[PDB]
């Protein structure tokens, strides 16, 4: 299949060079897989989700997404127009309030919940978790992410928007998970993106068009936007049976476009997520 006039991020993730506008992908579209979006929630009623999204847990007075950050990320995972895995199942875990903030005790609880809840769900192709959040270093938050990954869940986390080494940010600094950096439409490192040895892969994270609350859309930037590209790619590859949750991040790195990115500090991987689709 192909999506003409697709957002640049999707087209980039299916091409070996920048500047294209079509998104080539196998029509399986991650069907059978599940992606947990641990964020500010999801506007499950958005027409772009086609009823494939639903809230499963909130730690606040409502499960409604009053911020839009979570909805934006969920859309890059598998919305009809702006998603990587257009046929995946989306589950929303609300660990951040409508101001995009939340305590580490809540975020940890949210991750333990996904490790157990997946046993109630029908996900024969695998389970993915997308965490577009993070803060200061914390071994407990790192430990929770490692537990989630260990439980058989492909965990993807944002590297942070500090233009610094991700070693001082959690759960980004947890080596056992997949830490995603951000790049712009010209194969340059996003000026805000963090770097470091702990980074595993880069993704489109500058000027990313996706769904927003109110049945609308808008373009924002951040490693929060690059992580869902990788999460959706994982669910996509896992449906095709090319990798597993335990080795997905490694498979994406071995099949990535290498050397295309610029402004990559020495010691940081120069890898760009890529589906390697052939008709
Ligand atoms: Ca890693
Ligand atoms: Cl913990």
Cα maximum dimension of the chain: 48
Ligand nearest to the CA of 253: 1
SS3 46: coil
Q: Rounded distance, CA 239 to CA 233, Å?
A: 10
Ligand nearest to the CA of 110: 2
Q: Summarize the annotated binding site as residue ranges.
A: 16, 175, 177, 200, 260
Please give the method by which this entry was determined: X-ray
| 3-state SS record for 22-43 | CEECCCCCCCCCEEEEEECCCC
Q: Summarize the annotated binding site for Ca(2+) as residue ranges.
A: 16, 175, 177, 200, 260
For the question of residue 98 being annotated catalytic, the response is no
Q: Rounded distance, CA 213 to CA 194, Å?
A: 28
Kindly tell me the sign of the dihedral angle through the C-alpha atoms of 6, 214, 207, 239. negative
Distance from Cα 3 to the centre of ligand 1, integer Å: 31
Q: Rounded distance, CA 218 to CA 196, Å?
A: 30
Structure tokens at 30: 């991650």
The DSSP result for 90-133, as a single string, is EEEEE-S-TTS---HHHHHHHHHHHHHHGGGS--TT-EEEEE--
Q: What is the radius of gyration, based on Cα positions, of the chain?
A: 16
Q: Rounded distance, CA 214 to CA 209, Å?
A: 15
For the question of residue 69 being annotated catalytic, the response is yes
Helix, strand, coil fractions of the chain, as percent rounded to 5: 25, 25, 50
Structure tokens at 249: 């991040």
For the question of residue 190 being annotated catalytic, the response is no
CATH superfamily of domain region 1-279: Peptidase S8/S53 domain (3.40.50.200)
Distance from Cα 216 to the centre of ligand 1, integer Å: 34
Resolution in A: 2.2
Catalytic residue among 46, 69, 72, 229: 69
Structure tokens at 164: 């610094």
Give the C-alpha distances (Å, rounded to integers) separating 262 from 23, 125, 271: 23, 35, 11
Q: Which residues surround ligand 2, an ion (CB under 5 A)?
A: 140, 143-144
Which residue is associated with the tokens 């003409």? 4
Distance from Cα 123 to the centre of ligand 1, integer Å: 24
Ligand nearest to the CA of 166: 1
């Amino acid at each position: 299949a192909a999506q003409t006039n697709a957002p640049w991020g999707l087209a980039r993730i299916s091409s070996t060079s920048p500047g294209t506008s079509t998104y080539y992908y196998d029509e399986s579209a991650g069907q059978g897989s599940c992606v947990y979006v641990i964020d500010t929630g999801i506007e499950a009623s958005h027409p772009e989700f086609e009823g494939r999204a639903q809230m499963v847990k909130t730690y606040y007075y409502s499960s409604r997404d009053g911020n839009g950050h979570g909805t934006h990320c969920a859309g890059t995972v598998g919305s009809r127009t702006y998603g990587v895995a257009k046929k995946t199942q989306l589950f929303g875990v609300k660990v951040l309030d409508d101001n995009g903030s939340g305590q580490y005790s809540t975020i940890i609880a949210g991750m333990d919940f996904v490790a157990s809840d997946k046993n109630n769900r029908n996900c024969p192709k695998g389970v993915v978790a997308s965490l577009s959040l993070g803060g200061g270093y914390s071994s407990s938050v790192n430990s929770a992410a490692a537990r989630l990954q260990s439980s058989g869940v492909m965990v993807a986390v944002a590297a942070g928007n500090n233009n610094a080494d991700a070693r001082n940010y959690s759960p980004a600094s947890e080596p056992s998970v997949c830490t995603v950096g951000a790049s712009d439409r010209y194969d340059r490192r996003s000026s805000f993106s963090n770097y470091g040895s702990v980074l595993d892969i880069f993704g489109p994270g500058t000027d990313i068009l996706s769904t927003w609350i109110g049945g609308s859309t808008r373009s924002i930037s951040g490693t929060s936007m690059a992580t869902p590209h990788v999460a959706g790619l994982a669910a996509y590859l896992m449906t095709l049976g090319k990798t597993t949750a335990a080795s997905a991040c490694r498979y994406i790195a071995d099949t990535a476009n290498k050397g295309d990115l610029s402004n990559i500090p020495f010691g940081t991987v120069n890898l760009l997520a890529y589906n390697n689709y052939q008709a």
